[PDB]
Design a protein around this nucleic acid. Structure first.
Ligand SMILES: [Mg+2]
Ligand SMILES: [Mg+2]
Ligand SMILES: [Mg+2]
Ligand SMILES: [Mg+2]
Ligand SMILES: [Zn+2]
Ligand SMILES: [Zn+2]
Lengths: 184, 368, 368, 184
DNA sequence: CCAAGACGGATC
DNA sequence: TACAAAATTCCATGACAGTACGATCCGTCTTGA
DNA sequence: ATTGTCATGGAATTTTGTA
DNA sequence: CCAAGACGGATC
DNA sequence: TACAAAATTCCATGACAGTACGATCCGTCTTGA
DNA sequence: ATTGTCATGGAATTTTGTA
């Protein structure tokens, strides 16, 4: 049996309807299976048209062998099935109501969910400009179990911007009250 | 002037004039019988004027000026007086072409790691395709991996927006570019300083300095030309196809693709290499480090027979960038302040300030 | 295709495939165990398609295309199938740059007598001086004597009016010029035929063919530039001064001025040569004939290591004059009809007619 | 004593008020002393301004040592004296009422006087276009005494257009009646 | 007397 | 019949090849309130 | 049916003046 | 249906 | 241990260098009387 | 304060298959 490699499986998912920032509302999250490298793409809608447009910029750099996604309408569409057929990519869909990706992918996806909201509190209309620095933070996060960052696993070298110190990713006392006031 | 010629006529010897020849006065002027013919010897004071008169006829070089003076006049060391006047003439120094070639071209060491050196340049104003006209080209110094970005303008804001999507992958150490307005701007200078990136600039009007992006532009244009044969020039949609094609292209001398040098393994691209299929990723990255270090380095070509090397204190002339019609293509003589390498020097220019110029746009001042 | 691979699997030998290697069927496809790795052997019919698929990715050369196919496929004589496809691709033949230099430049014999060959050319649109913009330059092939004529337009009527004042001195045998509209016109063709003058034309887009007028234009511009330093560009009044200056200028390699080669004796020009003062005119003209015949002839430079020589029946491609953005810089393959000299041939062009083109604007068709 | 050479003496003279041709009325005749080479220049007036303009085109090719002319106002002017002084040319003026040039120069000047009128009869308004072919005819006229044409004496070679046959330069019977009718 | 602009310069 | 230096030749080198114009930003000099 | 050319100015070689 | 013109092509 | 030819390496060669526009004449296709 | 580069495709050299 062959060992796990980069570009083997690409985990794609949308994260909620975020507050408007420069016309954008949705974020397409792309996570590699082996390296755990994260690609973030700003989108206006959770549609197939927005998914195809964002992935075309990604596939111009590197093409995945398998694309993994949930039973979302943007991925289960026939237009997205024809899109993957032209580039020779097999589509893998997780079982409804309960997704399956693995410990490394789910722990990475958990960090993206909380890191975005941590920087979103106080400035909900300014998450678009943070997207580049969020991608750099995730890809240079010192791996919990392994001794290799997503940057080191993909390229082979250490990054020029290594994130040495870590904030606990948790919301502080007064940050919780401000986050509970923005909704109500 | 008059004392040297007076003693010569009466038989007394003066150094320079041979004693074997006969010296006689005719028409109130000193003449000499020579194998070439009867030639007039002028006084020292008039010699400076005569050389100037014969030179200003057509502004000619050493031999062509002397042959005009040799028609009538003769004196000891004629060429030494001609060459002296040749270095005095301002019109000749800033117009005449140099007969000395530049030194051997340096081949700088290939960047050690990926994202160590970034080469960026626009490919001019291409025919309008979906509103876009310009293409920002980013070339990695180590691997040769290319990122293409369509833009409507060669502006700072267009460069920043395109690089912000790129720097999401990895932050480069040094970004090299030509002295374009978008790159020399203070807005772009504060952009790179904010992320901790050093800006490197090419010597003005020397496009081969940033060759890694300029040579890649040839491969981009050549591929776009072939894809648009018999078709209307719509290149906007072909850019992501060209980007994927050239990055997966095998270099016949390097044996590896820009994609293989950056990641180690080929993606789901057509005709993918699966030689490292058995080995693990940790073993694949260990093999990748050995490949990157053991790549060929082009040796410097031998120096030409007539080449000049710049030194500190030497008088040099800077080449005029885009000279107007019937206007000098060289600047006023300038002194070399510091030599960085045998190809690049810092000079106090015609304006009166420090300027880093490559030797290709420079010539040594004649008659020194 | 299927018969050759079927006999190979069962142990029977076929020429091309070595018997030492093991051949096995896997996933419904024939594979071979090789030192490089496990490679798939395709049938003969599919081989033509696979090479086309790997080539059309980035339109690459011999080695760069094979390295893509070597990732998965192997068969006897791979490059012979690649090179065959390289000569079939129309997009590659009319875009790729030639790696073969042109043959050694010919140095044609200097005209024997004055007024045997006349070289004419305009020096572009110069800055407006007293209404005039263009300068017609007439250079004698033998002596190098130059006549300058200021004109407002590069038209036939402007060329005829200027030459009519010149032909008052002497009628030339052959007038050589580039393929300009004023010279290729039927009005100019009937002008020269009326006086019994043969018209000679340079090969299209090859300015060095009529170099005797092109190199003189460098001396005209260089002298006009030096005379207009720190002054507004008024060249109209300086033309008669420049004409007199360059004609009386000594050539350091020829030892004689264009004036001295044409007449024999210097006029009342500043610094006039009076060596033939004692001899009579009949003896002066007899000496002039000996000077004209005994001038140096520049020997042809040695041929470069990788140079091509044109032959009758060889496929060549003509260079596109001014190619548009992202458009091919070579024309469709064409056959050589006749070879005039090792530098000039007559070819049936893309339009479908006879055309005289120099080898500098031509490349040999690759893969033949 | 030095033998006679080209560019030694340039004989210049105007020939009458000829009928209007393209705005021109006068012809400046330039004859070399030794070679006998003829330069013809069309002028609108017998003035110094027209003489300077025409000679500037000639002096750009070759400069004479001595310029010879009659006591005409165009040559005896102070403006023409300053013109010759700048280029370093000595001016020689012939005695009034009786000119002196020599047998070779006067016989050449006699031919120009009669050759122009020969071609002028029948077409008095079209002598401007004949000027180039008249100059070629005179400079290639086989010398009466010597065996060298003005072209052969100046350049050293025979011309590409040698005038083999000669018309007697005389006006025919009916050409005389037409010439006597144009005036009266 | 100062804020938005006008303009040649430098480089591609 | 040998010097040293002037005088002369050798020869690699570059420029002539229809050119002016736009687009960007920056440092500097305007023009009405 | 046509084709490179030549000014330039350091270096390389030859000539020159006086033994 | 034809005379002055309009227009892209070729080359500088 | 030696062939012949395939396979591989060698390496001179050119193009990337912001480009489009005008001016001339000629062969060809219009547009009103 | 900075620096030429590399695809191309015939020729030159090395490797290969089978003695
Ligand atoms: Mg989702
Ligand atoms: Mg640029
Ligand atoms: Mg021309
Ligand atoms: Mg008179
Ligand atoms: Zn000068
Ligand atoms: Zn191709």
């Amino acid at each position: 049996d062959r060992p796990q490699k980069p570009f083997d499986k690409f985990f794609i998912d949308y994260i909620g309807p975020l507050p408007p920032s420069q016309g954008y509302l949705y974020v397409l999250v792309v996570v590699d299976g082996m390296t755990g490298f994260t690609w973030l793409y700003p989108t206006k809608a959770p549609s197939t048209s927005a998914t195809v447009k964002s992935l075309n910029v990604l596939t111009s750099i590197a093409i995945p062998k398998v694309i993994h996604s949930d039973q979302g309408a943007a991925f289960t569409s026939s237009t997205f099935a024809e899109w993957a057929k032209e580039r020779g990519i097999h589509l893998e869909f997780s079982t409804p109501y309960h997704p399956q990706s693995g410990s490394k992918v789910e722990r990475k996806n958990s960090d993206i969910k909380r890191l975005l909201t941590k920087l979103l509190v106080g400035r909900p209309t300014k998450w678009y400009d943070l997207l580049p620095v969020v991608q750099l933070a995730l890809n240079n996060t010192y791996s919990p179990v392994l001794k290799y960052t997503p940057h080191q696993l993909l390229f082979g070298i250490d990054s020029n911007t290594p994130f040495a110190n870590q904030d606990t990713l948790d919301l502080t006392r007064e940050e919780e009250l401000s986050l509970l006031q923005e909704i109500r | 002037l008059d004392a040297e010629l007076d003693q010569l006529l009466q038989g007394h010897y003066i150094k320079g004039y041979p004693k074997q020849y006969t010296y006689f006065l005719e028409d109130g002027k000193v003449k000499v019988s020579r194998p070439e013919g009867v030639k007039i010897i002028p006084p020292q004071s008039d010699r400076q004027k005569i050389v100037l008169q014969a030179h200003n006829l057509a502004h000619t070089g050493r031999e062509a000026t002397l042959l005009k003076i040799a028609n009538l006049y003769w004196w000891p060391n004629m060429r030494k007086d001609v060459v002296k006047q040749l270095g005095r003439c301002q019109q000749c120094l800033i117009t005449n072409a140099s007969n000395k070639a530049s030194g051997p071209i340096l081949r700088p060491d290939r960047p050690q790691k990926p994202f160590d050196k970034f080469f960026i340049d626009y490919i001019g104003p291409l025919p309008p395709s979906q509103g876009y006209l310009y293409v920002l080209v980013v070339v990695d110094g180590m691997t040769g991996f290319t990122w293409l970005y369509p833009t409507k303008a060669p502006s700072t804001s267009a460069t920043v927006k395109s690089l912000n999507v790129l720097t999401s992958i990895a932050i480069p150490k040094v970004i090299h570019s030509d002295q374009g307005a978008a790159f020399t701007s203070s807005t772009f200078a504060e952009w790179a300083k904010e992320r901790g990136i050093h800006l490197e600039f090419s010597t003005p009007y020397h496009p081969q300095s940033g060759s890694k992006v300029e040579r890649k532009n040839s491969d981009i244009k050549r591929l776009l030309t072939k894809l648009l044969v018999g078709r209307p020039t719509k290149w906007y949609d072909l850019l992501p196809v060209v980007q994927l094609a050239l990055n997966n292209t095998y270099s016949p001398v390097l044996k590896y693709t820009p994609h293989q040098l950056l990641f180690g393994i080929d993606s789901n691209t057509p005709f993918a290499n699966q030689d490292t299929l058995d080995l693990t990723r940790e073993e694949e990255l260990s093999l990748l480090q050995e490949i990157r270090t053991s790549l060929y380095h082009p040796s410097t070509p031998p120096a030409s027979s007539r080449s000049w090397s710049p030194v500190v204190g030497q008088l040099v002339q800077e080449r005029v960038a885009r000279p107007a019609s019937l206007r000098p293509r060289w600047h006023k003589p300038s002194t070399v302040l510091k030599v960085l390498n045998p190809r690049t020097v810092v000079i106090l220019d015609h304006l009166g300030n420090n300027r880093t110029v490559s030797i290709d746009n420079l010539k040594p001042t004649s008659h020194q």
